[PDB]
Amino acid sequence: TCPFYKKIPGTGFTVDAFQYGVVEGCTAYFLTHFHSDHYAGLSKHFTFPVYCSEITGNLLKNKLHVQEQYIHPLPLDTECIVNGVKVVLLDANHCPGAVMILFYLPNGTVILHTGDFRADPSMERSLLADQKVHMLYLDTTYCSPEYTFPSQQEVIRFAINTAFEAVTLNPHALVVCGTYSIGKEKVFLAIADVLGSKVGMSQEKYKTLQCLNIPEINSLITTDMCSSLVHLLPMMQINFKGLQSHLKKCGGKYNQILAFRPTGWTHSNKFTRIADVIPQTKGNISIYGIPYSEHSSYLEMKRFVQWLKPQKIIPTVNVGTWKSRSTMEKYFREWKLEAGY
Numbered sequence: 458t459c460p461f462y463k464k465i466p467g468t469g470f471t472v473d474a475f476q477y478g479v480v481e482g483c484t485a486y487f488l489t490h491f492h493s494d495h496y497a498g499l500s501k502h503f504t505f506p507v508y509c510s511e512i513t514g515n516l517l518k519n520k521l522h523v524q525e526q527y528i529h530p531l532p533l534d535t536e537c538i539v540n541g542v543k544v545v546l547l548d549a550n551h552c553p554g555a556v557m558i559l560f561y562l563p564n565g566t567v568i569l570h571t572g573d574f575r576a577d578p579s580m581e582r583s584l585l586a587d588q589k590v591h592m593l594y595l596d597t598t599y600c601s602p603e604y605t606f607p608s609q610q611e612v613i614r615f616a617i618n619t620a621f622e623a624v625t626l627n628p629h630a631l632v633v634c635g636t637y638s639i640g641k642e643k644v645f646l647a648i649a650d651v652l653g654s655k656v657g658m659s660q661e662k663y664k665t666l667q668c669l670n671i672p673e674i675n676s677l678i679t680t681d682m683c684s685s686l687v688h689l690l691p692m693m694q695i696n697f698k699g700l701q702s703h704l705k706k707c708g709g710k711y712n713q714i715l716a717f718r719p720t721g722w723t724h725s726n727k728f729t730r731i732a733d734v735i736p737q738t739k740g741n742i743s744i745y746g747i748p749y750s751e752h753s754s755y756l757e758m759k760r761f762v763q764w765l766k767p768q769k770i771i772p773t774v775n776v777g778t779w780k781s782r783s784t785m786e787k788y789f790r791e792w793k794l795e796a797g798y
């Protein structure tokens with residue numbers, strides 16, 4: 458049954474609740490972003506209003522074939538009225554089109570639902586600064602102190618330098634980047650840009666990227682693999698068997714693969730600096746695991762919450778075990794006592 462943490466009290470609204478069939482008494486279904494655990498259940502047969510960002514609206518229309526009369530895209534940073542309730546969509550710093558949602562209840566409660574987000578100090582100068590939030594529905598993906606990772610900027614620097622160096626030493630090396638969903642486009646686009654190549658990918662993937670309102674995308678991507686030395690493949694195929702295979706397919710245009718697997722977190726983060734990352738190598742194939750996160754680290758999350766000072770926190774991630782739940786509630790209490798709210 459629809460869980461309580463996907464329901465907005467005092468409204469007929471749900472958030473990311475498309476896999477439960479008809480949710481009793483739901484008058485508007487909000488979608489934070491186009492990732493499968495969140496959209497699961499949408500299709501061309503959905504006949505209720507869906508509210509979302511313009512980019513997420515493009516992906517519903519073109520990838521899932523949701524009919525246009527049920528898609529209600531909203532501009533960001535703009536006060537809008539949905540079924541008589543004032544709402545604002547804010548940038549979530551997650552994947553393209555990902556939003557957080559501010560609900561202004563008739564009775565005067567203000568509710569922020571983060572969707573998936575990577576908290577950042579820039580959010581402290583959005584519309585959020587202008588009024589108090591009583592309840593926070595928080596993306597708690599990495600809510601434990603062991604989760605540290607570098608800035609996105611430091612990680613992209615690492616990848617750019619690595620790739621530029623390898624291909625300048627060997628102009629017959631191919632770079633491969635793994636993907637299984639939107640997000641993390643900066644990885645493969647930054648590399649292609651430093652090498653003066655377009656990124657080659659399947660037609661299905663090129664279609665997905667054309668939905669995202671990225672400036673000058675026609676200049677950076679292509680479905681012609683031959684003319685490209687940065688290839689995007691499914692994340693599944695980023696392993697020695699999968700890469701040896703792909704290399705055979707290129708017909709001796711290339712003699713070496715350098716591949717990137719942008720993962721969330723890995724236990725090498727507790728020990729290893731970004732400067733200190735090494736690949737796994739077999740033969741003429743090297744694989745780099747890089748910690749490019751589109752979720753908040755524990756410290757980023759803690760700062761955002763201590764800044765916002767909500768009266769109640771509702772976790773949306775890692776809620777399935779008692780030990781998880783109970784550990785998160787302990788951190789919330791530490792944060793609150795340390796900051797004085």
Ligand code: NI
Binds near residue numbers: 490492551573
């Ligand atoms: Ni997500």
